[PDB]
Amino acid sequence: MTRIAINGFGRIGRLVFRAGIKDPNLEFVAINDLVTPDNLAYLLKYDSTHGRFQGTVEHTEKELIVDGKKILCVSERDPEKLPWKDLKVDYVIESTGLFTDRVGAEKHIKAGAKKVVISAPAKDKDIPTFVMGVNNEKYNPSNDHIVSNASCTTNCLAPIVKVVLDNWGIEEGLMTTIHATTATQPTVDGPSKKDFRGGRGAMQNIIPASTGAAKAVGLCIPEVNGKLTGMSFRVPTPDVSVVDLTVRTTKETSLKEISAKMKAASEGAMKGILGYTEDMVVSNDFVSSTLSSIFDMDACIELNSRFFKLVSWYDNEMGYSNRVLDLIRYMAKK
Amino acid sequence: GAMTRIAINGFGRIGRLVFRAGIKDPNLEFVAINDLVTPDNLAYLLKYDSTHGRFQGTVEHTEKELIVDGKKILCVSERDPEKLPWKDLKVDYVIESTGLFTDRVGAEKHIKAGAKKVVISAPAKDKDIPTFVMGVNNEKYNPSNDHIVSNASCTTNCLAPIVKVVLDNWGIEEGLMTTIHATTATQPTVDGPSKKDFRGGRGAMQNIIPASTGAAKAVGLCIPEVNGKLTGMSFRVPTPDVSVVDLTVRTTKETSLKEISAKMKAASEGAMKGILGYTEDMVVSNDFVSSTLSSIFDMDACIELNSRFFKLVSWYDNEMGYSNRVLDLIRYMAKK
Amino acid sequence: MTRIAINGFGRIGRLVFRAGIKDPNLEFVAINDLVTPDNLAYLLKYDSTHGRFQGTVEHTEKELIVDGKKILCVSERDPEKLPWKDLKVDYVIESTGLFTDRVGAEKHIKAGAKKVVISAPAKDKDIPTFVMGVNNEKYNPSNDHIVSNASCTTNCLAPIVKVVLDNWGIEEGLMTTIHATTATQPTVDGPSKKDFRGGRGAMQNIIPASTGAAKAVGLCIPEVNGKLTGMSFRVPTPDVSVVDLTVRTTKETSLKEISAKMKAASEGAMKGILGYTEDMVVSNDFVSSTLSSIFDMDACIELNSRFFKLVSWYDNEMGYSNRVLDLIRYMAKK
Amino acid sequence: MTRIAINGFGRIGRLVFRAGIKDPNLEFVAINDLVTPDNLAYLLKYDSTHGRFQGTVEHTEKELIVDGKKILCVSERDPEKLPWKDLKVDYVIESTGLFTDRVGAEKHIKAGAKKVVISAPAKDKDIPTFVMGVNNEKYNPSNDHIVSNASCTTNCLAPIVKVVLDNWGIEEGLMTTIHATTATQPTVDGPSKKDFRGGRGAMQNIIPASTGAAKAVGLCIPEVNGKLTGMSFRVPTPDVSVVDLTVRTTKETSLKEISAKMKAASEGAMKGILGYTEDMVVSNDFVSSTLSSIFDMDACIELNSRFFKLVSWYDNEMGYSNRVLDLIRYMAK
Ligand SMILES: NC(=O)c1ccc[n+]([C@@H]2O[C@H](COP(=O)([O-])OP(=O)(O)OC[C@H]3O[C@@H](n4cnc5c(N)ncnc54)[C@H](O)[C@@H]3O)[C@@H](O)[C@H]2O)c1
Ligand SMILES: NC(=O)c1ccc[n+]([C@@H]2O[C@H](COP(=O)([O-])OP(=O)(O)OC[C@H]3O[C@@H](n4cnc5c(N)ncnc54)[C@H](O)[C@@H]3O)[C@@H](O)[C@H]2O)c1
Ligand SMILES: NC(=O)c1ccc[n+]([C@@H]2O[C@H](COP(=O)([O-])OP(=O)(O)OC[C@H]3O[C@@H](n4cnc5c(N)ncnc54)[C@H](O)[C@@H]3O)[C@@H](O)[C@H]2O)c1
Ligand SMILES: NC(=O)c1ccc[n+]([C@@H]2O[C@H](COP(=O)([O-])OP(=O)(O)OC[C@H]3O[C@@H](n4cnc5c(N)ncnc54)[C@H](O)[C@@H]3O)[C@@H](O)[C@H]2O)c1
């Protein structure tokens, strides 16, 4: 049984917990956040986006009790003061958003944790980044003790890029994500030290945003390094995002051939990772989807035999959370 | 001085905003409004605007007219444009903004009713109606022959000036556009039927909704040099007004974002003044509510992959900018 | 087995269909709407609010196939031309919004239907109105061939009123409902001859609206006839509403005592109709709730021993759709 | 000229600044917030709700330059270390939300300010609360050095209560406010130790909230103390709220008479505070209104001659900000 601790019981932390408490192979031993177990228990059972927790939730002054299983609840701002050694934590899910650099994420290993999974792109280039179904086989159990699971957008874009790249090559690519609002944005216009637009009211605006997903894809798919960039527009929805990839391929092809390969990948080497649809879907048709990427056949367009606009959905919350579990399960086995 | 007589068929978002923008012009004379509701509901919707605020002036009504700033305007309720009294009113231009008469057969009812010229506030349903975008191809207008015209779409009016600047300076090999578009009256609040686009029937408050757009092809019409070289799509999002275009374009000559921004800023200060705007500020959509521009180039949001591959971003108030272009086109046609 | 046809496959019609199609005692034989089976099947499969249909959906040019069941699909503007006599319809669910008067509803009877259930308050004083768990025992099989299941708000308010009246009496009561947006509202400012406010954009505004639910409960609970009125505020939410009842009681009492009686009723009589909670719930905690009314203890306030403000939630879509089934089932058995 | 500093350049602080920088009798000398002048210049210039600043906005490392006027920008978390004596600050607008107690607000006076106006209800009983046009005349310049301007909801409800009470008395009143989302709420579900609902996603939910605004009216209008209580529902709108008041009056009356008195007040002794409308209004019809309260005659309902439901709108951002300025101008005269 693999022992897991969660640092940051937020949107991602609670969703990895919800997805993982079902697995007998996993054991969640601790949750760390800046609030009491009462509020953690409330946020676990009630979810404005993914519905009520399908199970029993209780709490003590010192723990949550989920389906009878006891999980320790601690509240320490500094990860170094966490009891990871006493709980002998194998994996710590770093999902606070505040320790995406190595010096901060190294604090969990100092506390006694064996492996640290950062649920976000790393700020340092020396932390390996993995996307399940793209480059997770490059993981080194003997050396990679702090890893990154990339971004929700990277996890959506990289599988699409991989199928296109494998079959027709990519000369150039520009991506746009139309992304759901997240917790980093305020409800009304407010301060924002390093991105002024990011402080504008998320309920009111379409908001241009930077994304690192494109080059992060360059990390996971080196063959596309230097050939893709991207940006983002935050829109006033609470969850589910979509990627629009304009691609110039090397070989001539058509949308029918691309769709054939996407469908094949979704049924084969990327089943459970890449999804495929021909239906007239809109974003809420993917609420609580566990897939990283859902290729939208009807929304795609072809300018000509080498220029395409490919569209893929993702639940930026639920899909990433399940990938976080998938990566841990992989690391534990291999 | 001399006055152009205008009637509005369809007193909706575009119709009321065309009225708001044009009633300030002393050379224009709005002589009639046609819609399916009595002047009482029309006065109410004219007075109060959830997006552009209260009407800055006095609005009253009778059973047969609105009274705006002392001026009386005839208010009729006739579904059939053919039964409208355009001949009696000596209507020079009819703004067809109901959304139901974008083909020649439907718009021709206004000419049969007596109007001299008809401006469709939308893309024509068929290529047999000429389309004009101010500052791009409105000089190709023929006063003696083009009696039914189209002012294209908001997206076309935003995309085309960008395309024009890029093409004239570096050429275009390919261009793929996406518009992130505000919600409009064609979408319901909750999931409902929609025969012509199933996605079009899903709830607008809840979803990102992929949609089809003809704006790319329409620009190919207004700019023949670019025909076949541009396509596009749309995503409707839960905002009530203001949209943004994201154009992925491959140029012929090598260039850079600095050079492109230089030409965009030059165009906005020169030949496309009042049509194309230019900004370097960290703007978001609500910063353009009630903007009169067709297209506002957003230098900070643009990205360059390489010397020939760029992602250009341009905003537009799909209600207010288009309504101001409808008036400009009518003014242009009047002068010649 | 009871044979049911649905006129108007909209929000209410589709949800009634979702809740009932698993029922072996019910047989849905026909669906009538203004579109062909492909759009109806699409709308049955994907719901922006209640998620994907948990089952299989197929279609023909003339029929739907749900979980193997074949349902005829028609498109007739005039109910009088519907094949109810030929299909032997026991109950017709009138959920178009256009035939809530007796002359309009009677067209289903002339076409061959035996019973018509209007999914809204009737425009006619001689059409009986029932709220399950409040006054449905007054249904007379021999005379009530066209009945009304009231409004979603009436089904929420009446259970609250029933308990308070039965235990402490009601001298006066004023109701306010904060109501989710519905299909009658536009996305942007537009015309609306019978209620100008109703035409204003639902995404942007709090919109005052009139409601008849207050007098309608006077119909179902005659003891309160003439003693309560109400109003409504439409807000930019796609589903779930809340009732805020300001009530002057006859006998002295306390919030503790009221909550205790609400809790008893939720666990015994009115079980499945009235729900009870002491948690810090918000509207999305009730998406796809099947209850008519959920009493919110913590949201309630007491001015004094005879003046209370009681709060109760309801999924105006799902709860009402389930009560339409319950009403049909009650009528069917006797 | 009155020398004013703003502590907390947020929604209220910036909107107070916009309305007041136009006033030649006022002199804004300093702004304190936790961000650099660039971000403050940005937020002053562009407003998602009230549009672009109608004027010129410039900034340096150490100041804002608004319409030619130079204003100091400081970034100090502890108000005791603020440069109020050097700047000779007459009034400090406390709009951070973190110093609504006397121990906290008094730090501005310890720092050199003469008066402190809190843009929110005070925590302490000994800090007087004023509503313009209701009880502001009770201000005592010799002793009231820290005052509260109450809440946006109290400023909307109290004028309504005053006219009803003066004409027909109040036996009971229960108020509900349908309130716009504010900076206190997250976009998505998150923690909130003292009120769990307050942490739920504001874009997707109707959110019940506690309010003291009814009880505050009991303080500003002592005759109604113990007779009025209330609650709140936060809804997914960015601005403008509405109060809904269920009132049992003492004297028999009618909606027609109440409306007449409301219209009389809006035109007379509460012009600029109380507004009156008979139109079919909705929330966005009041964006950027400077009124505290707008009586909505058509939305009102009468159960009988003594039981009414009265409805009044308010721009919780813009109306309150103007009340803060009005209070400062009153205290300075
Ligand atoms: N939201 C998404 O869709 C998404 C997708 C992929 C990855 N991510 C990444 O996951 C990370 C978390 O995102 P989220 O949306 O769950 O955010 P969130 O704000 O919902 O959760 C973060 C949580 O961390 C807790 N926390 C903060 N500081 C802490 C500390 N010092 N110690 C312990 N707990 C602390 C907070 O109370 C909060 O609940 C971010 O870095 C984000 O970029 C988010
Ligand atoms: N909304 C935008 O941003 C935008 C911008 C550019 C172009 N347009 C075009 O303008 C047209 C109208 O757009 P809108 O947003 O104003 O729509 P809208 O829903 O506001 O409708 C326009 C008006 O037409 C009236 N109408 C309907 N049938 C009529 C009839 N038979 N006779 C007279 N009036 C009738 C309606 O009552 C309505 O008020 C569409 O063709 C649209 O494509 C819209
Ligand atoms: N949505 C709610 O919260 C709610 C709650 C309780 C009851 N209701 C009542 O139920 C009724 C339906 O409301 P809704 O929200 O489902 O509306 P809706 O607009 O979602 O669905 C109504 C359907 O009627 C169909 N229709 C229209 N004309 C028709 C005709 N002539 N013949 C056949 N079908 C026709 C339409 O295509 C449409 O799908 C209303 O009367 C409403 O007041 C609504
Ligand atoms: N927004 C409304 O509708 C409204 C109406 C009436 C009253 N109020 C009250 O006014 C106050 C401000 O609310 P708001 O909506 O403007 O909030 P906001 O979050 O928009 O602004 C608060 C500001 O305080 C500043 N701040 C935080 N800590 C600080 C510190 N230590 N020193 C200096 N500045 C600091 C922050 O950067 C932030 O800009 C609150 O007390 C609120 O309850 C708000």
Calpha distance A274→A266 (Å, rounded): 5
Residue D27, token pair as written in the block: 């002199």
CATH of the domain at D17: 3.40.50.720
Chain A residues interacting with chain B (CB cutoff of 8 angstroms): 172-174, 176, 178, 195-197, 200-201, 204-208, 227-231, 233, 235-237, 240-242, 244, 246, 248, 280-284, 296, 298-299, 301-304, 307, 309, 311
The beta strands (E) that lie in C63-169 are given as 63-66, 69-74, 91-94, 115-118, 146-148
Q: Which two tokens stand for residue A72?
A: 């320790």
Out of B54, B281, B284, name the one closest to residue D285 (CB). B54
A58 contacts: CB under 8 Å, gap ≥ 6:
A41, A64, A65, A66
How close is the Cα of C188 to the center of ligand 2, in Å?
11
- The Cα–Cα gap between B260 and B266 comes to 10
Closest CA to D180 of D160, D212, D207, D199: D207
Residue A82, token pair as written in the block: 């966490």
Eight-class DSSP state of B145: T
Q: Test D235 with C240 for CB contact under 8 angstroms.
A: no
**Which candidate, A49, A65, A69, places its Cα nearest to that of A57?**
A65
Which amino acid appears at position A123 of this protein?
Answer: K
| Full DSSP string of B275-291 | TEEEE-S---GGGGTT-
A25 and A104 both lie in a single domain:
yes
Q: How far apart are CA C185 and CA C207, in angstroms?
A: 10
- Do A111 and A199 belong together in one domain? no
Taking Cα atoms as reference points, which of D301, A157, D42, D69 lies closest to residue C208?
Answer: D301
D321, part of any domain: no
Question: What Å distances lie between residue B118 and B6, B7, B93, B109, B332, CA to CA?
Answer: 10, 10, 5, 10, 14
Q: What is the 3-state secondary structure (H, E, C) of chain D?
A: CEEEEEECCCHHHHHHHHHHHCCCCEEEEEEECCCCHHHHHHHHHCCCCCCCCCCCEEECCCEEEECCEEEEEECCCCHHHCCHHHHCCCEEEECCCCCCCHHHHHHHHHHCCCEEEECCCCCCCCCCECCCCCCHHHCCCCCCCEEECCCHHHHHHHHHHHHHHHHHCEEEEEEEEEEECCCCCECCCCCCCCCCHHHCCCCCCCEEEECCHHHHHHHHCHHHCCCEEEEEEEECCCCCEEEEEEEEECCCCCHHHHHHHHHHHHHCCCCCCEEEECCCCCHHHHCCCCCCEEEECCCCEEEECCEEEEEEEECCCHHHHHHHHHHHHHHHC
CA distance to A211, C82, C98, C109, per residue, from C79 (Å): 55, 5, 11, 9
Q: Which amino acid is at D136?
A: N
**Short-list A275, A153, A293, CA closest to A212:** A153
Whether D159 and D120 share a structural domain: no
CA distance A269 to C158: 56
Mutate to test the pocket of ligand 2, among B35, B86, B98 (most ligand atoms within 8 A of CB): B98
* Nearest-angstrom CA–CA distance, D117 and D112: 14
Residue A295, phi then psi, degrees to nearest 5 = -70, 125
Same domain, B92 and B203: no
B313 by DSSP, 3-state: which?
strand
Contact B50, D282 (CB under 8 A): yes
Please, what is the end-to-end C-alpha distance for chain D in angstroms?
A: 11
**Which residue in the block uniquely carries the two structure tokens 């089932």?**
C329
Q: Are residues B106 and B44 in the same domain?
A: yes
* CA A273 – CA A276 distance, rounded (Å): 10
- Is residue C181 assigned to a domain? yes
| Whole-number Å distance between alpha carbons of A261 and A30 | 42
Radius of gyration of chain D (CA): 20
Q: What are the CB-based long-range contacts (under 8 Å, 24+) for B73-79?
A: B73/B30, B73/B31, B73/B32, B73/B33, B74/B31, B74/B32, B74/B33, B75/B32, B75/B33, B75/B34, B75/B35, B75/B38, B75/B39, B75/B42, B76/B32, B76/B33, B76/B34, B77/B34, B77/B35, B77/B36, B77/B37, B77/B38, B78/B34, B79/B36
Say if residue B227 is in the same domain as residue B101.
Answer: no
Do B108 and B163 lie in one domain? The reply is no
Beta strands in chain C (DSSP E): 2-7, 26-32, 57-59, 63-66, 69-74, 91-94, 115-118, 146-148, 170-180, 207-209, 228-235, 241-249, 274-277, 293-296, 301-304, 307-314
Any domain includes C94: yes
C157 and C111 part of one domain: no
What is the per-residue burial (b if ≥16 Cβ within 10 Å, else e) of C153-168?
A: bbbbbbbbbbbbbebb
Same domain (yes/no): C164, C204: yes
D200 domain-assigned: yes
Which ligand has the minimum distance to the alpha carbon of residue A321? 1
CA–CA separation, C254 and C259 (whole Å): 9
What are residue A324's phi and psi, to 5 degrees? -55, -45
For residue B197, count CB atoms less than 10 angstroms from its CB and return exposed for 0-12, middle for 13-18, buried for 19 or more.
Answer: middle
B153 carries a ligand binding annotation: yes
> Scanning the structure block, which residue is given the tokens 């989710």?
C180
Integer Cα distance of A250 and A232 in angstroms: 26
**C-beta separation of B164 from B314 below 8 A:** no
For B198, the token pair is: 């199933």
Q: How far apart are CA C205 and CA C201, in angstroms?
A: 6
**Percent helix, strand and coil across chain C, each rounded to 5?**
30, 30, 40
State which residues form the domain around A277: 152-316
Q: Report the greatest alpha carbon distance in chain D.
A: 63
CA distance C183 to chain A (A): 18
Distance CA D213, CA D218 (A): 9
The 3-state DSSP class for residue B53 equals coil
Looking at residue C144, what DSSP letter applies?
Answer: -
Is residue A135 one of the residues assigned to a domain? no
CA dihedral sign, ordered C118, C122, C125, C130: positive
**CA gap D330, D313 in Å, rounded:** 24
Distance A190 CA to ligand 4 centre (A): 10
CA C182 to ligand 3 center in whole angstroms: 10
Catalytic residue among D73, D152, D220, D300: D152
Q: Both tokens of residue C113?
A: 């239907």
Do the Cβ atoms of C217 and C223 come closer than 8 Å? Answer: no
Task: State the amino acid at position B14 in one-letter form.
Answer: I
- B135 lies in a domain? no
* Ligand 1 pocket test, candidate residues A17, A32, A33, A179, most atoms within 8 A of CB: A33
Looking at the fold, whether A287 and A161 belong to one and the same domain comes out as yes
Atom of ligand 2 nearest to the CA of B154: 6
Angle at A40 between CA C309 and CA A198, to 5 degrees: 90
Number of domains, chain A: 2
How many angstroms separate the CA atoms of A78 and A66, rounded? Answer: 26
Which residues are within 8 A (CB) of A164 and not within 5 positions of it... i.e. 6 or more apart?
Answer: A170, A247, A249, A258, A310
Q: Which residues of C touch B198 (CB under 8 A)?
A: 39, 42
Among B220, D231, D270, CA closest to C301:
D231
CATH of the domain at D264: 3.30.360.10
The experimental resolution of this structure, in angstroms, equals 2.4
User: Residue C169 CA to chain centroid, in angstroms?
Assistant: 26
Q: Is C143 exposed, middle or buried (CB count within 10 Å of its CB: 0-12, 13-18, 19+)?
A: exposed
- For residues D181 and D222, membership in a common domain is answered with yes
Residue B52 and residue B241: Cα distance in Å, rounded?
10
| Residue B169 domain-assigned (yes or no) | yes
Ligand nearest to the CA of C315: 3
How many angstroms separate the Cα of A223 from the Cα of each of A134, A226, D35?
A: 12, 9, 41
Is D190 touching ligand 1 by the criterion CB < 6 Å? Answer: yes
How was this one solved?
A: X-ray
Instruction: State the DSSP string of B186-255.
Output: TSBSS----SS-TGGGS-TTT--EEE---HHHHHHHHSGGGTTSEEEEEEEES-SS-EEEEEEEEESS--
Cβ atoms of D109 and D200 closer than 8 Å: no
Q: What is the 3-state secondary structure (H, E, C) of chain A?
A: CEEEEEECCCHHHHHHHHHHCCCCCEEEEEEECCCCHHHHHHHHHCCCCCCCCCCCEEECCCEEEECCEEEEEECCCCHHHCCHHHHCCCEEEECCCCCCCHHHHHHHHHHCCCEEEECCCCCCCCCCECCCCCCHHHCCCCCCCEEECCCHHHHHHHHHHHHHHHHHCEEEEEEEEEEECCCCCECCCCCCCCCHHHHCCCCCCCEEECCCHHHHHHHHCHHHCCCEEEEEEEECCCCCEEEEEEEEECCCCCHHHHHHHHHHHHHCCCCCCEEEECCCCCHHHHCCCCCCEEEECCCCEEEECCEEEEEEEECCCHHHHHHHHHHHHHHHHC
* Residue D73 annotated among the catalytic residues of the structure: no
Ligand located closest to C212 CA = 3
Size of interface A-D (CB pairs under 8 A): 113
Give me the residues paired with residue D59 across strands. Answer: D64
C7 neighbors C313 (Cβ within 8 angstroms): no
Longest dimension (CA), chain C: 63
Residue C114, domain member (yes or no): yes
Residues A19-31, buried b or exposed e (16+ Cβ, 10 A)? bbbeeeebebbbb
Short-list A240, A241, A242, A244, CA closest to A230: A244
- Minimum-distance CB partner of B191 among C47, C196, C203: C47
Residue A197 annotated as binding site: no
What backbone torsions phi and psi does residue D23 show, to the nearest 5 degrees? -85, 120
Instruction: For residue C187, give how far its alpha carbon lies from the nearest alpha carbon of chain B (Å).
Output: 6
The strand ranges marked E within C83-203 are: 91-94, 115-118, 146-148, 170-180
Tell me the Ramachandran region of residue A52: left when phi exceeds 0, alpha when psi lies from -120 to 50, beta otherwise. Answer: beta
C4 near C27, Cβ under 8 Å?
Answer: yes
3-state secondary structure of B258: helix
Neighbours of B108 (CB within 10 A): 16
Tokens encoding B255: 């260039």
Q: Which residue has the tokens 């015994």?
A: C268
Asked if B209 and B61 sit in the same domain, the reply is: no
